Design an enzyme around this catalytic site. Structure first.
Site, PDB file in Angstrom:
ATOM      1  N   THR A 141      45.070  51.347  38.082  1.00  0.00           N
ATOM      2  CA  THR A 141      45.256  49.984  38.486  1.00  0.00           C
ATOM      3  C   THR A 141      43.862  49.445  38.706  1.00  0.00           C
ATOM      4  O   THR A 141      43.195  49.798  39.682  1.00  0.00           O
ATOM      5  CB  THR A 141      46.127  49.919  39.731  1.00  0.00           C
ATOM      6  N   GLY A 142      43.407  48.655  37.749  1.00  0.00           N
ATOM      7  CA  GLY A 142      42.128  47.979  37.835  1.00  0.00           C
ATOM      8  C   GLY A 142      42.335  46.733  38.660  1.00  0.00           C
ATOM      9  O   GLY A 142      43.451  46.474  39.133  1.00  0.00           O
ATOM     10  N   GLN A 143      41.276  45.946  38.826  1.00  0.00           N
ATOM     11  CA  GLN A 143      41.389  44.696  39.573  1.00  0.00           C
ATOM     12  C   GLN A 143      42.124  43.754  38.603  1.00  0.00           C
ATOM     13  O   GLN A 143      41.658  43.662  37.475  1.00  0.00           O
ATOM     14  CB  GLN A 143      39.980  44.166  39.987  1.00  0.00           C
ATOM     15  N   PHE A 144      43.320  43.210  38.957  1.00  0.00           N
ATOM     16  CA  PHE A 144      44.132  42.266  38.140  1.00  0.00           C
ATOM     17  C   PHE A 144      45.474  42.783  37.584  1.00  0.00           C
ATOM     18  O   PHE A 144      46.323  41.964  37.214  1.00  0.00           O
ATOM     19  CB  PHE A 144      43.359  41.658  36.954  1.00  0.00           C
ATOM     20  N   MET A 166      36.697  52.122  26.895  1.00  0.00           N
ATOM     21  CA  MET A 166      35.484  52.654  27.509  1.00  0.00           C
ATOM     22  C   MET A 166      35.867  53.975  28.149  1.00  0.00           C
ATOM     23  O   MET A 166      36.304  54.021  29.301  1.00  0.00           O
ATOM     24  CB  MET A 166      34.961  51.620  28.532  1.00  0.00           C
ATOM     25  N   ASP A 176      29.647  37.735  39.115  1.00  0.00           N
ATOM     26  CA  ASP A 176      30.100  38.919  39.864  1.00  0.00           C
ATOM     27  C   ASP A 176      29.529  40.180  39.231  1.00  0.00           C
ATOM     28  O   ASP A 176      30.238  41.166  38.999  1.00  0.00           O
ATOM     29  CB  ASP A 176      31.628  38.995  39.989  1.00  0.00           C
ATOM     30  N   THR A 235      41.348  45.264  24.720  1.00  0.00           N
ATOM     31  CA  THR A 235      39.890  45.340  24.660  1.00  0.00           C
ATOM     32  C   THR A 235      39.424  46.692  24.165  1.00  0.00           C
ATOM     33  O   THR A 235      40.166  47.693  24.128  1.00  0.00           O
ATOM     34  CB  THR A 235      39.238  45.104  26.076  1.00  0.00           C
ATOM     35  N   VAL A 253      47.704  46.637  35.773  1.00  0.00           N
ATOM     36  CA  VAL A 253      47.685  47.998  35.243  1.00  0.00           C
ATOM     37  C   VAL A 253      46.881  48.019  33.944  1.00  0.00           C
ATOM     38  O   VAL A 253      47.064  47.147  33.094  1.00  0.00           O
ATOM     39  CB  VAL A 253      49.133  48.540  35.024  1.00  0.00           C
TER      40      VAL A 253
HETATM   41  C1  LIG Z   1      38.993  50.328  37.702  1.00  0.00           C
HETATM   42  C2  LIG Z   1      39.527  51.583  37.028  1.00  0.00           C
HETATM   43  C3  LIG Z   1      40.871  51.377  36.339  1.00  0.00           C
HETATM   44  C4  LIG Z   1      40.774  50.513  35.084  1.00  0.00           C
HETATM   45  C5  LIG Z   1      39.705  51.059  34.132  1.00  0.00           C
HETATM   46  C6  LIG Z   1      39.469  50.131  32.981  1.00  0.00           C
HETATM   47  N1  LIG Z   1      39.570  48.793  33.001  1.00  0.00           N
HETATM   48  C7  LIG Z   1      39.265  48.348  31.741  1.00  0.00           C
HETATM   49  C8  LIG Z   1      39.350  46.969  31.488  1.00  0.00           C
HETATM   50  C9  LIG Z   1      38.498  46.090  32.157  1.00  0.00           C
HETATM   51  C10 LIG Z   1      38.593  44.725  31.964  1.00  0.00           C
HETATM   52  C11 LIG Z   1      39.510  44.197  31.060  1.00  0.00           C
HETATM   53  C12 LIG Z   1      39.726  42.731  30.841  1.00  0.00           C
HETATM   54  O1  LIG Z   1      40.731  42.327  30.265  1.00  0.00           O
HETATM   55  N2  LIG Z   1      38.786  41.900  31.354  1.00  0.00           N
HETATM   56  C13 LIG Z   1      38.810  40.498  31.430  1.00  0.00           C
HETATM   57  C14 LIG Z   1      39.943  39.698  31.229  1.00  0.00           C
HETATM   58  C15 LIG Z   1      39.804  38.316  31.344  1.00  0.00           C
HETATM   59  C16 LIG Z   1      40.980  37.417  31.119  1.00  0.00           C
HETATM   60  F1  LIG Z   1      41.933  37.953  30.347  1.00  0.00           F
HETATM   61  F2  LIG Z   1      41.585  37.069  32.253  1.00  0.00           F
HETATM   62  F3  LIG Z   1      40.662  36.302  30.475  1.00  0.00           F
HETATM   63  C17 LIG Z   1      38.550  37.803  31.643  1.00  0.00           C
HETATM   64  C18 LIG Z   1      37.494  38.663  31.838  1.00  0.00           C
HETATM   65  N3  LIG Z   1      37.600  39.996  31.732  1.00  0.00           N
HETATM   66  C19 LIG Z   1      40.395  45.059  30.416  1.00  0.00           C
HETATM   67  C20 LIG Z   1      40.302  46.402  30.658  1.00  0.00           C
HETATM   68  F4  LIG Z   1      41.147  47.221  29.983  1.00  0.00           F
HETATM   69  C21 LIG Z   1      38.981  49.389  30.927  1.00  0.00           C
HETATM   70  C22 LIG Z   1      38.577  49.611  29.561  1.00  0.00           C
HETATM   71  N4  LIG Z   1      38.405  48.605  28.666  1.00  0.00           N
HETATM   72  N5  LIG Z   1      38.357  50.844  29.113  1.00  0.00           N
HETATM   73  C23 LIG Z   1      38.504  51.912  29.906  1.00  0.00           C
HETATM   74  C24 LIG Z   1      38.857  51.803  31.228  1.00  0.00           C
HETATM   75  N6  LIG Z   1      39.051  50.523  31.741  1.00  0.00           N
HETATM   76  C25 LIG Z   1      38.374  51.245  34.874  1.00  0.00           C
HETATM   77  N7  LIG Z   1      38.545  52.149  36.026  1.00  0.00           N
HETATM   78  C26 LIG Z   1      37.961  53.367  36.082  1.00  0.00           C
HETATM   79  O2  LIG Z   1      37.383  53.821  35.122  1.00  0.00           O
HETATM   80  C27 LIG Z   1      38.087  54.228  37.324  1.00  0.00           C
HETATM   81  C28 LIG Z   1      37.378  55.563  37.333  1.00  0.00           C
HETATM   82  C29 LIG Z   1      38.840  55.521  37.105  1.00  0.00           C
END
Ligand SMILES: C[C@H]1CC[C@@H](c2nc(-c3ccc(C(=O)Nc4cc(C(F)(F)F)ccn4)cc3F)c3c(N)nccn23)CN1C(=O)C1CC1
Ligand SMILES: CN(C)CCCC(=O)N1CCC[C@H]1c1nc(-c2ccc(C(=O)Nc3nccs3)cc2)c2c(N)nccn12
EC number: 2.7.10.2
Length: 255
Positions: free
Chosen positions: A19-22, A86, A130, A83, A24
């Protein structure tokens, strides 16, 4: 959204990353072959079509050191954001994993990766607002990329310059300040900046000229670069182009 609209039939879910910020986030595949991260937007949590300005941003902004949007699934609810995947996840958790036994050359590479993304955003007149290790991600090759770009207690007090805390004066120089704090996060292996203080105490110490100490792993030359982001006068802080040249110089000299 034209060509950015992904057909959800093309997605296969393989693992819940967390669960990331925003909402699942899940690891998955697109058309059974391409690795992707799939973010399910939490219901009503954020907001309307008007907030899909962030998509207009993600659909126009693109760089090798920015987490790349591949597409969206909007003709259904919950909305999916597709996306770049990573594999090493969040930079802050990556830094805290003591098993990596990072060399300072690797830490400086992480700074350079972020600085390149920020120079690009500066060049596009975009303000991240941010920038912090929690908003950076790491791929399978150890490359760091900036995510959540201009998305958007919970205010990032510890990544903010005095003029932001006192007057809400946001500028490219408040992103410069946050970047120096992000270099400190990297060189301290993910310590919380001002870890002995609350946010209210950090803001008063920052108003009084307190600055983050040199982390043990940062050389005096690397420290000078992060410290240059923290000049009280915003106009005395460098640009990202200058920071990038400074980091490249230290890498050539030290590495
Ligand atoms: C936090 C935890 C749990 C989540 C993990 C995580 N979040 C993203 C990820 C990060 C951002 C976005 C995304 O959509 N961003 C966004 C979306 C908008 C919007 F859509 F609203 F316009 C605007 C700006 N940015 C999408 C994603 F899949 C990703 C990713 N691409 N790859 C791997 C892991 N990721 C990271 N963590 C970890 O790795 C921890 C260690 C376990
Ligand atoms: C060969 N393979 C990767 C493609 C075939 C694999 C494929 O189609 N995939 C894999 C995951 C979902 C789907 C997908 N990817 C994209 C996309 C867009 C831009 C860039 C880019 O690099 N843009 C840049 N802009 C400026 C600089 S770089 C890279 C990928 C897009 C898209 N725009 N709409 C719909 C689906 N999309």
């Amino acid at each position: 959204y034209g060509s950015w609209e992904i057909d959800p039939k093309d997605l296969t879910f393989l693992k819940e990353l967390g669960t990331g910020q925003f909402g699942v986030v899940k690891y998955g595949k697109w058309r059974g072959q391409y690795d992707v991260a799939i973010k399910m937007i939490k219901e009503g949590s954020m907001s309307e079509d008007e907030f899909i300005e962030e998509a207009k941003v993600m659909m126009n902004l693109s760089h090798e050191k920015l987490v790349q949007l591949y597409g969206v699934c909007t003709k259904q609810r919950p909305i999916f954001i597709i996306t770049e995947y990573m594999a090493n996840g969040c930079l802050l958790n990556y830094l805290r994993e003591m098993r990596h036994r990072f060399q300072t050359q690797q830490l400086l590479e992480m700074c350079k990766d972020v600085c390149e993304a920020m120079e690009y955003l500066e060049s596009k007149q975009f303000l991240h607002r941010d920038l912090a290790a929690r908003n950076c991600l790491v791929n399978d090759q150890g490359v760091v990329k900036v995510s959540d770009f201009g998305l958007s207690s919970k205010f990032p007090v510890r990544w903010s310059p005095p003029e932001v805390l006192m007057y809400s004066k946001f500028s490219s120089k408040s992103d410069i300040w946050a970047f120096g704090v992000l270099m400190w996060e990297i060189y301290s292996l993910g310590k919380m900046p001002y870890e002995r203080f609350t946010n209210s105490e950090t803001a008063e110490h920052i108003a009084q000229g307190l600055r983050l100490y040199r982390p043990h792993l940062a050389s005096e030359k690397v420290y000078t670069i992060m410290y240059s982001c923290w000049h009280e006068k915003a106009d005395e802080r460098p640009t990202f182009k200058i920071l990038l040249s400074n980091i490249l110089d230290v890498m050539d000299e030290e590495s």
